Design an enzyme around this catalytic site. Structure first.
Site, PDB file in Angstrom:
ATOM      1  CB  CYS A   1      -0.896  -0.080   1.254  1.00 18.75           C
ATOM      2  SG  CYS A   1      -1.886   1.371   1.744  1.00 18.75           S
TER       3      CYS A   1
ATOM      4  CB  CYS B   1      -0.415   2.350   4.300  1.00 21.90           C
ATOM      5  SG  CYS B   1      -0.546   2.705   2.514  1.00 21.90           S
TER       6      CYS B   1
END
Length: 104
Positions: A29, A32
């Site tokens: 991600c 994050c």
């Protein structure tokens, strides 16, 4: 927390004495952990009310499993080591807010 994993889960998340919330972030991600968007806001929104945590999904291949977290982010809402509500996606700010106040 610094970073929630299987060991720290019981210690930080289940043992805060206070309503708990956990942001599930993933290395894929990006960074994050330091983003934790709505969760970062629920922190200042519910200052004292809640214990704000961020789970390193790659570091906890037991927690993510057990809680059926298929999306990054996902957030789970606990009270005092007791789970109440699970917001998959963890993106509609209002629902997440709704989620504390429900039990808190």
């Amino acid at each position: 927390v610094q970073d929630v994993n299987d060991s720290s889960w019981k210690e930080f998340v289940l043992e805060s004495e206070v309503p708990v919330m956990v942001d599930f972030w993933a290395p894929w991600c990006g960074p994050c952990k330091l983003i934790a968007p709505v969760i970062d806001e629920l922190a200042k929104e519910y200052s004292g009310k809640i214990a704000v945590y961020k789970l390193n999904t790659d570091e906890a291949p037991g927690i993510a499993t057990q809680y059926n977290i298929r999306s990054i982010p996902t957030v789970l809402f606990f009270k005092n080591g007791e789970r109440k509500e699970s917001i998959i996606g963890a993106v509609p700010k209002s629902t997440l807010t709704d989620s504390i106040e429900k039990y808190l």
